[PDB]
Structure formats: C-alpha cells, structure tokens
Design a protein around this ligand. Structure first.
Ligand SMILES: O=C(O)c1cccc(Cn2cc(-c3cccc4c3N=C(N3CCOCC3)CC4=O)nn2)c1
Length: 816
C-alpha cells in the first residue's frame, strides 16, 4: 500500500518513521506535513514537464566550463549503426539529422523529436551546444575513443516520465531558574550560562554558585541576565556549560528562547546534555537523544505575562571607504551611523554592517531590518559569507537564500556539500535553506542524488539524525521512483560492507590469494551478484554499474582492506568499464573536501582558459566511516612504476615512453607538466603534506594526480611548495638542462597560483561554512588562517607573486 513506501523510506534513510512519530513534537509533525505537501506538489509540476524539460530534470547535461571526428550512432530498436564524420563545432541536431537521414536511405524512407543518449550511460546530448562542449564528446577526443550514441525518440522519453510517476513591553532583566541535574564526575560543580546571537554575546555570562560534585546538582537559583526581555532578538540562544573545579569540562546544552512559532518559551525544561571536549554557542539547539546516559539540567523559564516575536510589519514600523578598504569601536559607530550610505553606495558591505549592529538592542535590530527589506540582491559570493553562523537572524538567512536562488545548477552542485553542513547551524527544522535545497533537489535529479547521500552519510551522528532523516523523507515523498533507484544503491553498499567485513576477517587467517578466492565465491552468490549489479553509481548517477565482473575484483593490503570493484557493460562498451573503491573504517570526509576543492580550482582555471589536465575523481561518504572512491583506470602509483631502467630517475619517463610511443610522447610530457603544475599549486595552497610516491599516481596519458589526502592544512607545520627531482626530470624531457621547458612550467604554476588568489574569498567563504562539519583538521581560526597565508591574501598581487617566487625557488633548491 503506502505501507510499502513507508517501509521503503525507513530502510533507505536508515531510521524508522515510527521514531519520528514517537517524539510527539508538533515542530516535527508540522515539518513533516508541511514539506511533504511541498515536495508532492513539486512532483506534480514535473510529471507534466515537456520531454526536453524532463531530460533536463533526469539527465542534466554534462558540459565543459573547426575540427573533425568519427561518431557512431544507432537507433533504440536495432543493432545497426552508422559512423559519420562530424565537426566538433556541430550541433546535436545536425548529427541527429544525418542519422535520421541515413536510416531513411537504408530504410527506404524530423530531428527535433529526438535526443542522443550516450550508450550505456544515463547521459544525453541535446540543446544548442557544440559537440565539444559536451563532456562525453570532450572525454573521447582527449582519450582518442569514438563516441557511441543512441537516437531516442520523444515518445520513448515520455514513456519514462509516465513510468516514474508517484514583546516591546517587558523591561525586566531576563532570567531563568536553574533547578537541578544528574551526571558523573570527580570538586564542586558550576553551571556557566550565557546568551548568544551567533558568535556574539548578548551580555555577560552569569555563572552558578559552587555545589559539591556528587549525584544531582541541586541549585534552585535564579539567574538574571544583563539585558531587557524586550531586547532579546528573534534568534536568541541560551547556552549552558556544566563543569567541575578545585579545570574539568563535563557537558553543554543550548536552546532557543523562542520556539518555532515565535512564542517566547515558558518555563520548565529538561536539557539532555552533550559530553564536552567552554560554552558552545555553535552547538545544536536540540537535546541529546541518549536520554538514558546523558547528564541532564532542569531549568525554569519564567512566565513574563502569551508573547510572540513581533511581526515584520511592526518591525518595519519601528574615511568610511578607507576602513572598508575586524575594526575598532569608533569605526563600528561610524559604520552604523552610515548605514543608509552603506545600503545606497556600498550594498556589498552588508555583512560588515550586520556585525556592527547591536543585536542586544531591539530598536537597532529594527532599523537594520528595515534597511535589509529594501536591500538590493547580492552576488553569490557575498551570499555565501552570509550563510555563516555569524549571521543567525532569520531575515538575513532569508535574504541570503534569495540571493542564492540565481545559482545555476552547476554552481549549486559545486557548493552543495557546504550548504548541507550549514543546516547544522540552523535553529529550527522548517527553514528557508531546507526548502531551497529540497526544491532544487526535486527539480534536478543530480542535485537530489548528492543531497540524499550527503544527508544519509551522517545519520549515525545523533546531533543531525533527526534533521537529516526528516529532509530525506520529504525528498522521498517528492520522488517515489528515485527512492527505488537509491534503495538499489543502498543494497549494493550493504552487500559491500558485509563482503568487506569478511575480507577483514579472512586476511587474518589466510593468504591474500586464498582470501581473494573466497571474496570471489562470496560475490558469485545470487544475492550478491544481483545486489551488486545494475545500478547507478553513487559517485556519479550518470555512470551505470552494470555487470560486476569479479575475477578483476580484489582488495588492498592496507588495514581496512579497501575493496576494488570492477564493472563492465556490453551496451556502453569501453565507457562502461568502470571501477569503484569501497572503503570502510576510514573517514572519507577530508578526501571529499579536498577533491572538491581541487575540482573547483580546475574549474576556476578553465574559466580563464587554463586546463591543467587535472583528475578530480569522485569521492563520496555514504555512511559511518564508509564510502566510495572512483577508480581512475590506466593509472598507477609513482611508487609502483619505480619498480627496465639503469637509473631510477628514468623509470618514470621510460614508462611514459612505453605507453606513448613515437610522437605521442611530447603530448604526454605536456600533460604531465600541466598537471604537475596544477597539483604543485593545489597541494601548496591546501597545505597537503605527507606526499610521497605511494600517493601520487600518473595516467598513461601522462597526467599526474594525487590520492589519499589524509592531512591537509599544514596539519601543524607549514608545508612548503614541493618540487620532486623525478618530476622536474620528466618536465625537462629527460635532460639535465632545459630552461625553456622548465621556465614554461614555472609560468604555468604562477598563472595557476595568481588565478586562485583572485578567488581567494570564494575559498575562504567555503572553508568557513565547512567549519560546521566537525572535521578535526578544520576546527578553528588557525586552519582558516592557513589558507589566508598560503594565498597571501593580505598582499598586493605583486608582493604575493614575489613571495611565491621565493617559495618556488626554495622548493627547487630542495630538489637536487
Ligand atoms: O596490492 C594490491 O593487492 C593492490 C590491489 C589493488 C590495487 C592496488 C593498487 N592501488 C592502491 C590504491 C590506493 C590505495 C590507497 C588509497 C587510494 C588508492 N587508490 C585511489 N585511487 C583513486 C583514483 O583512481 C586511482 C585509484 C585512491 C586512494 O585513495 N590505488 N591503487 C594494489
């Protein structure tokens, strides 16, 4: 019935829907019914889209940021195929026209009723684009391969659509009553309490009287805060810390003083606390769900009267440049004084102005909000800064989203990971960000795919399980069919975990050959063959993983026995020969961020016409210390290649010569040189140390790349720029001296470095939002500072390039 759907979502999301119901929370009840309708009406809209708009939803085009080629085309019904020669500048229509036209000759006898499917992939070619804007066509040209496509008629596409259908009054100083608690420690117990608006204190942090450290922490005190109740802003957050002293932190807990209906809360409360690492303003505002084990604090919120935060209508009723290029009190005063100027003449300095406004004075907040309601839209870069925890106000949050609505699907995808982490900072379940993500996800299946996995991957974290579960359920209501596709992915991943556990056990008792044989036998079981085959890759939904082909599957020798799983697809040909690595026991989150950043650098470079031949391979956490990495085929580790050469320095170049005979070598050396420049710069900027020959790989094309990003951000040394002699040797064509090739290489590096600096704030804004994620190596200011320093953002370009040159020369000396 709908019974089945409910049980399908419960399995898919990793939480039973009955668990939601058992909280008997209207916030949650309302979140669920609110969004379910929102998601259900989005499904509505889509089931009536035109066939090209459906393609846009389900198969978003994959593009790049004159000359001729051979393309093979067939039609959906037959085996017969035709090979033409087309231009890289041609449109898909022209290609479809030739295809149609021929079929007519051989078929004894209108392009616009067709789209071209990439054989064996969930990828289509359509739209007004040259064939070498399409990533698959591009891929084939740089690799040499022949594009194989299938003419799909509009009515076949519509068959797919149809088969996937579903107040100011209160001047008294704010106060609470700290009643008692129930905890464990060695001393006397103190409760410190403090009121926050983002990172900023709304007043001084009143503390408890000292009470012995045994059993319950009875207090029955009245805590009064240095602030009027009418001055508490909408997003006011009360923050506790319980600790011992003769310092020993024990626990923390936060809550919103206003509930999700704008009512000021009153009065009693049991706060189930989170274990501590001293106040944690950024911490979640929801209680610890381990209500058996957690220490708890009972408090009382006094009745001040029913009081709601005023509606917007009431709210609305109530040397500049030289500092505007982190400032003093008099500077702040100037900026606040100048707010109208700021809006009219420096609209992009909104963030600055927001941080100087007095959130602990309601009158000031009102005047700021009135400016905000007429404020011009901001660039996306500026909106990314506003998503920071430092901007907690809901109107600000809403303004930020409003400026982000113009994000292209491509941009949104590039920033999605960060936007999901920002949900952790949200105060309430129903929020503009969640609505925006769910809307965009329901309009673009790729976005929906990566949103799903970002959420699913953290369900084992109790602070986000509820929020993320709820979002995934909403999403599933909005696409029943995608829900089935994702279940199939879940079933594969479930089987891989079991397979990997077995491998961990077996390798402890037997040789690797024996274990591998057992792995193979396990995989050939009907249940495994079936679970592991015929699915969309979680790494990239457009890649279909068809028949898992064992004999080629193995596992690595390293601790948590990462699995190496290979696939083939008759229908896709060579493009269907794809591999994934399943890893369980390692935290994949830091490879994802890093690989993501590298992707963004590649994109920023390509946007200036600089293609450094980078390899931004897929990486996707799917669960608790679980996830996938995309295999880059026809590549091996530097270590491995340093394995016939008389001198070890030549092993690399000999290998390249062997894979690139004759005049092919010069292209490979160029690919090596550009990619080396890319990764030299990327690893310097990102502070990725511990680079060695086991975690640097090369492709047979010549392109160098990095794997195993365990320790970025100098993490803390200050990782120098690195040039390896073996790499300089290849760049210089195996010559001792070749300053023509070398100083070109030095040019590539400098160009790459200077382009990144120009987008320095993009990197800082993105890393700022990633502080939400609790990555151990992105936890504080010192980590953000690393980026500031590596991009030398405090300098003029010039100064920065001179600085960079010292470092480059530094690195060169180091490489004998
Ligand atoms: O010794 C073996 O039995 C063995 C079995 C299968 C493969 C290998 C060689 N190997 C190991 C790895 C490897 C080891 C540890 C970490 C990683 C990794 N490869 C990775 N990739 C990613 C992109 O595609 C190339 C492989 C990523 C990665 O993080 N890559 N290749 C060795």
């Amino acid at each position: 019935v709908k019974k089945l759907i409910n049980s399908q979502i419960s399995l898919l999301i990793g939480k039973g829907l009955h668990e939601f119901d058992s909280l008997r929370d209207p916030e949650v009840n309302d979140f669920r019914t609110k969004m379910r309708q929102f998601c259900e009406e989005a499904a509505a809209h889509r089931q009536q889209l035109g066939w090209v708009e459906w393609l846009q939803y389900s198969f978003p085009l994959q593009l790049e940021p004159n000359r001729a080629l051979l393309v093979n085309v067939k039609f959906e019904g037959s085996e017969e195929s035709f090979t033409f020669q087309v231009s890289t500048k041609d449109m898909p229509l022209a290609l479809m026209a030739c295809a149609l036209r021929k079929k007519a000759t051989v078929f004894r006898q209108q392009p616009e009723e067709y789209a071209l499917q990439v054989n064996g992939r969930h990828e289509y070619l359509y739209g007004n684009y040259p064939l070498c804007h399409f990533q698959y066509i591009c891929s084939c040209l740089h690799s040499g391969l022949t594009p194989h496509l299938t003419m799909v008629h509009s009515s076949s596409i519509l068959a797919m659509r149809d088969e996937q259908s579903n107040l100011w009054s209160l001047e008294q100083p704010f106060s609470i009553e700290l009643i008692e608690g129930r905890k464990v420690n060695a001393m006397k117990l103190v409760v410190q309490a403090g009121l926050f608006h983002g990172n900023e204190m709304l007043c001084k942090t009143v503390s408890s009287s000292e009470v012995n450290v045994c059993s319950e922490p009875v207090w029955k005190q009245r805590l009064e805060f240095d602030i009027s109740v009418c001055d508490l802003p909408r997003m006011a957050r009360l923050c506790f810390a319980l600790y011992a002293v003769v310092d020993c932190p024990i626990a923390w807990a936060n809550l919103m003083l206003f509930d999700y209906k704008d009512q000021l809360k009153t009065g009693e409360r049991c706060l189930y606390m989170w274990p501590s690492v001293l106040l944690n303003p950024a911490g979640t505002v929801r209680g610890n769900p381990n209500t058996e084990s957690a220490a708890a604090l009972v408090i009382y919120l006094p009745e001040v009267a029913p009081v709601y935060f005023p509606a917007l209508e009431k709210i609305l009723e109530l040397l500049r440049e030289i500092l505007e290029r982190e400032l003093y009190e008099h500077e702040k005063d100037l900026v606040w004084k100048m707010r109208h100027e700021v809006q009219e003449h420096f609209p992009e300095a909104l963030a600055r102005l927001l941080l100087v406004t007095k959130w602990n004075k309601h009158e000031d907040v009102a005047q700021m909000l009135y400016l905000l309601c007429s404020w011009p839209e901001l660039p996306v870069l500026s909106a990314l800064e506003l998503l920071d925890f430092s901007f907690p106000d809901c109107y600000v949050g809403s303004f930020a989203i409003k400026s982000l609505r113009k994000l292209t699907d491509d941009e949104l995808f590039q920033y999605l990971l960060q936007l999901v982490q920002v949900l952790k900072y949200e105060s309430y379940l129903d929020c503009e960000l969640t609505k925006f993500l769910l809307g965009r996800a329901l309009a673009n299946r790729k976005i929906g795919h990566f949103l799903f996995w970002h959420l699913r991957s953290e369900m084992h974290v109790p602070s986000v399980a509820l929020r993320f579960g709820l979002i995934m359920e909403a999403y599933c209501r909005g696409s029943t069919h995608h829900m089935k596709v994702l279940m199939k992915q879940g079933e594969a991943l479930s089987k891989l975990k079991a397979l990997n556990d077995f491998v961990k056990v077996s390798s402890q008792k037997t040789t690797k050959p024996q274990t591998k044989e057992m792995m193979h036998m396990c995989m050939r079981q009907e249940t495994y063959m079936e679970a592991l085959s015929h699915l969309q890759s979680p790494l990239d939904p457009s890649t279909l993983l068809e028949e898992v082909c064992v004999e080629q599957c193995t596992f690595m020798d390293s601790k948590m026995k990462p699995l190496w799983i290979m696939y083939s697809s008759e229908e896709a040909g060579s493009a269907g020969n794809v591999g994934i690595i399943f890893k369980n026991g390692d935290d994949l989150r830091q490879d994802m961020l890093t690989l993501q950043m590298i992707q963004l650098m590649d994109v920023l470079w390509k946007q200036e016409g600089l293609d450094l031949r980078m390899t931004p391979y897929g990486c996707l956490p799917t669960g608790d210390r679980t996830g996938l990495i995309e295999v880059v085929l026809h590549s091996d580790t530097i270590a491995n290649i340093q394995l016939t050469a008389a001198f070890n320095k030549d092993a690399l170049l000999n290998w390249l010569k062997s894979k690139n005979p004759g005049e092919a070598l010069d292209r490979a050396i160029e690919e090596f040189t550009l990619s080396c420049a890319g990764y030299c710069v990327a690893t310097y900027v990102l502070g990725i140390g511990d680079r060695h020959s086991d975690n640097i790989m090369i492709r047979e094309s010549g392109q160098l790349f990095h794997i195993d990003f365990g320790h970025f951000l100098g993490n803390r040394e200050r990782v120098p720029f690195i040039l390896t002699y073996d790499f300089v040797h290849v760049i210089q064509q195996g010559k001792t001296n070749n300053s023509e090739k070398f100083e070109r290489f030095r040019g590539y590096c400098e160009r790459a470095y200077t382009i990144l600096r120009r987008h320095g704030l993009l990197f800082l804004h993105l890393f700022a939002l990633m502080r939400a994620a609790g990555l151990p190596e992105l936890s504080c200011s010192k980590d953000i500072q690393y980026l500031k320093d590596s991009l030398a953002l405090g300098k003029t370009e010039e100064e920065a390039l001179k600085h960079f040159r010292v470092k480059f020369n530094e690195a060169l000396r180091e490489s004998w």
